[PDB]
Design a protein around this nucleic acid. Sequence first.
RNA 1: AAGUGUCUAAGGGCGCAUGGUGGAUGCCUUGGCAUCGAGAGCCGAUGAAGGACGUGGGAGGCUGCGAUAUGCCUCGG
Length: 65
Amino acid sequence: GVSPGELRELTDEELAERLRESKEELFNLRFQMATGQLNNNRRLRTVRQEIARIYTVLRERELGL
RNA sequence: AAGUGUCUAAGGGCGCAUGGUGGAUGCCUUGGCAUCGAGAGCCGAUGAAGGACGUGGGAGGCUGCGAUAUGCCUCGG
Ligand SMILES: [Mg+2]
Ligand SMILES: [Mg+2]
Ligand SMILES: [Mg+2]
């Protein structure tokens, strides 16, 4: 997935857009898993973890980075 | 003629032989019991103890966790 090291340079708005597009990817992966066209089922966990990473970066930024 | 004279088993008893059931005995153990030697002696409105519901690629329970959900970041091993 995406590294915290390569996430700690995006400012606030690139972070907010990465978050939104990652959520969109997770939505699409959920529908593909439901309809049976997903092969690599390890993608769900990866996308969830990168979303959690983006929240972690934003929260630590707004509380004394 | 008179007399003597067995055998058999519908079933049963006792003894063997050969099986079945059952789980005693023997020997164990990821479990307990009683202490001894050091700790630490409180937790909570900054929301506790304890829970309900959720959370995994596949059903449920335990266990971990909380919509960031068997996990996120950093520092060590
Ligand atoms: Mg007889
Ligand atoms: Mg007979
Ligand atoms: Mg390390």
